[PDB]
Structure 1
Amino acid sequence: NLPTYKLVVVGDGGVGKSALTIQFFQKIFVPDYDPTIEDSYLKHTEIDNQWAILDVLDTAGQEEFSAMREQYMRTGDGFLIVYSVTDKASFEHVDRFHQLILRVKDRESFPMILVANKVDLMHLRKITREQGKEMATKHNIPYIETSAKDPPLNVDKAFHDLVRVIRQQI
């Protein structure tokens, strides 16, 4: 009887969803992963001394959901809304992804964590910490800054914290 947590990584194109997922599961930074590939990953990890199965789907594409994408978006236990601190458009679309999850889930609130990625790119950073932290506290969801480029930053914590959010509900 092991618990399974279905997590979905959503965000604009290029924010680093594939980089983060591959970093989290395969412990390697893979630059320029195929932007259209949308597949799922599986591990058994122990969070807070409790074993858990992690079922993560790296989303891709903005058109209508494939049968796989849809059922993941409808049954997912939590979502990682990811934007790039170098792409102001991705930040303005956090609201779009936020509304999408609630509309699909038909809920007033759902387990979500705002993820600011590519923090390593400091010279080209466009969105500050207060900007992202305000966005997160606006949607009443946690905020984590991440970087999938070696050495990775908060990649494991981001996914683990999402599980923790799920465990501390209802």
Structure 2
Amino acid sequence: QVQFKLVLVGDGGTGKTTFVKRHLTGEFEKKYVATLGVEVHPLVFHTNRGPIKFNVWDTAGLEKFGGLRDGYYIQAQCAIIMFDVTSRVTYKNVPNWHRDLVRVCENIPIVLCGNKVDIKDRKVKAKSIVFHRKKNLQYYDISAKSNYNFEKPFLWLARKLIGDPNLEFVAM
């Protein structure tokens, strides 16, 4: 029922599993249980135009646990590439994830999410976050701990997918 295939990718130990758990339960995970391959989680929202479902494929961010790797990306309907703003490397690795993703889904709405902006000492200053511009990715600052822009990525993705720019998430 109006569900889409969403692929969450990014460097391991950045928050992908954290973000997915925060959206599913509402609690904020503290520990980093390194993901193995991919976990599929349904996630429901109530927009002004009814229910919506994201099939979040929270994929492992560590190569040693890459498993099927890009194989997971097949049939993906939307993509969230996510990094950590406190670790420059997790950003510089972003283009690799982007290339791998695009190689399977040429034309799919893509959101670059900077997780855990809450931490005081930000490393990847917004001034240097530019990769999205040329590639036409939609950027978003988020923080799974402070809940900042929690639904912004999903709201933007739903607007892109459905085609309703004025579509709005409702509480129930």
Q: Establish whether TM, by shorter chain, passes 0.5.
A: yes
Aligned to 1:62: 63
Aligned to 2:160: 165
Shift in Å, 1:48:
3.8
TM-score, normalisation: structure 1 = 0.85
Equivalent runs, 1:1-170 vs 2, <5 Å: 2-37=1-36, 38-60=38-60, 61-62=62-63, 64-66=66-68, 70=71, 72-105=72-105, 107=106, 109-123=107-121, 125-132=122-129, 134-149=130-145, 151-168=146-163
Shift in Å, 1:88:
0.5
Shift in Å, 1:8:
1.1
Give me the whole-angstrom Cα distance separating, in 2, the residues matched to 1:48 and 1:131: 35
TM-score, normalisation: structure 2 = 0.84
Q: Which amino acid aligns with 1:140?
A: N
Shift in Å, 1:159:
1.8
Q: Which amino acid aligns with 1:66?
A: L
Aligned positions, number: 161
Q: Which amino acid aligns with 2:136?
A: N
The structure in which a higher percent of residues are helix is 1
| Residue segments in structure 1 that go unaligned for 5+ positions in a row | none
Q: Deviations over 1:103-126 (max 9, x none)?
A: 123x2x321001011100122x11
Contact 1:23-1:30 at 8 Å conserved across structures: yes
Contact 1:78-1:163 at 8 Å conserved across structures: no
Give me the whole-angstrom Cα distance separating, in 1, the residues matched to 2:81 and 2:40: 16
Identity %: 27
* Aligned CA-pair RMSD: 2.0
| Residue segments in structure 2 that go unaligned for 5+ positions in a row | 165-172
> Bigger shift: 40-49 or 4-13?
40-49
